[PDB]
Design a protein around this nucleic acid. Structure first.
Length: 127
RNA sequence: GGAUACUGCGGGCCUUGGGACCGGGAGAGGCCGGGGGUACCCCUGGGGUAGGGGUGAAAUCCUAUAAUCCCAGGGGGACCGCC
């Protein structure tokens, strides 16, 4: 009968990771990244790479037997940026297209209720 | 020798300036003690396997002595988001 899983999507300005797991997240099924499907490093955060990686992950997941996924999208966060990258929505769309069904879509970025210092230096990057 | 408005000295009064006291309230004023919140780093188990990271583009660096990623736990030091 039906089978449910979870897609963790890690989205930064330099790459994207799609990782499909069981409900509990303790057993892993398919894990793909952006640098797995391109040669150049300046194109890993491509929405196209997001699409490809999500498609392959979803195909292998379905082969394993999963039918639906919940989605947890996640920017790096903490002391780093809270804004996700471009590949997140691309990956969600390509996942739904490739066949899997979709449940809840939640954003699980970590937020500082207050936090350790970030890496600038009181003036920031000065190009 | 005379005068007594103003200033000064001395002696009595006043309450407007100032100080004291009472009453219901406001406030991230200060010190001491207790209890907490996320986030971050390390360690130990489990899963999984080829890259991660970073840039304007790269390289050093970490990684097949199993990294990045997901899960269960244990320990630590700083800080108190939105309102």
């Amino acid at each position: 009968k039906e089978k449910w899983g979870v897609a963790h999507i890690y989205s930064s300005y330099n790459n994207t990771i799609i990782h499909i797991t069981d409900l509990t997240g303790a057993e892993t099924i398919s894990r793909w990244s952006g640098g797995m499907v391109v040669k150049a490093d300046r194109d890993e955060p491509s929405p196209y790479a997001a699409m490809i990686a999500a498609r392959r992950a979803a195909e292998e997941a379905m082969e394993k037997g999963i039918t639906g996924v919940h989605i947890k999208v996640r920017a790096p966060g903490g002391s780093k940026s809270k804004s996700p990258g471009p590949g997140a929505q691309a990956a969600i769309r390509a996942l739904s297209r490739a066949g899997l069904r979709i449940g809840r879509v939640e954003d699980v970025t970590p937020i500082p209720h207050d936090g350790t210092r970030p890496k600038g230096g009181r003036r920031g990057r000065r190009v």
